[PDB]
Amino acid sequence: LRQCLPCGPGGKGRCFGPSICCGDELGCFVGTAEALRCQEENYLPSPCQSGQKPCGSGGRCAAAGICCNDESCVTEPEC
């Protein structure tokens, strides 16, 4: 059980997908420079999952009011 590689502003956020980096007080970076290091997960053998509270289609609450899976992010009031 591990969250995926850290990313973004001072490694505060964490990876939810190859191109998704989200943080508690950060929000979500979808395909921005902050998400570049998230590609590295594709190389690690061990399976990871970030977030804690599940929502939507196999997603986890990535940031405030944001639910993300490994390829998308959506607004879910329950996050």
Partner: peptide, 6 residues
């Protein structure tokens, strides 16, 4: 690797 990608 991301769970559903592994």
């Amino acid at each position: 690797c991301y769970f559903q990608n592994c």
